[PDB]
Design a protein around this ligand. Structure first.
Ligand code: HEM
Length: 104
């Protein structure tokens, strides 16, 4: 995916609920720093739904690709209000940006 295109997507559709940097505050949604390689619902200090905490999968390019296409379908009961991103390419770009931004 194209990191720059993904940055634009993040800023327009995710930033209002999520920060990606280390130490970034939790907002409506949890801070995403360290996302890749971590299990669902493990960011300290954020009140996740039990649905998210119990999904039990590990966040990575593959799991994110599915989750972002339709959040509610992948994690029934999640309190994340987001319809999903239909275009495969857009999800690829966004995930490429997340891979970088949540690890710097
Ligand atoms: C496309 C943009 C977005 C992406 C890529 C995204 C991604 C994520 C990810 C990966 C998680 C899981 C974190 C974890 O398990 O530690 C999450 C959780 C969450 N997100 Fe988002 N998110 C986006 C937009 C939003 C928006 C717009 C809202 C709010 C209106 C939101 C609200 C939440 C909430 C409330 C949770 C925690 C849900 C729960 O505990 O069930 N997100 N998001």
């Amino acid at each position: 995916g194209d990191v720059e295109k993904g940055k634009k997507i993040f800023v327009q559709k995710c930033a209002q609920c999520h920060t990606v940097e280390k130490g970034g505050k939790h907002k409506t949604g949890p801070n995403l720093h360290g996302l890749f390689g971590r299990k669902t619902g493990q960011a300290p200090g954020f009140s996740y739904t039990d649905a998210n905490k119990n999904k039990g999968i590990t966040w990575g390019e593959e799991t994110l690709m599915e989750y972002l296409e339709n959040p509610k379908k992948y994690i029934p009961g999640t309190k994340m209000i987001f319809a999903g991103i239909k275009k495969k390419g857009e999800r690829e770009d966004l995930i490429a940006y997340l891979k970088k931004a949540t690890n710097e």
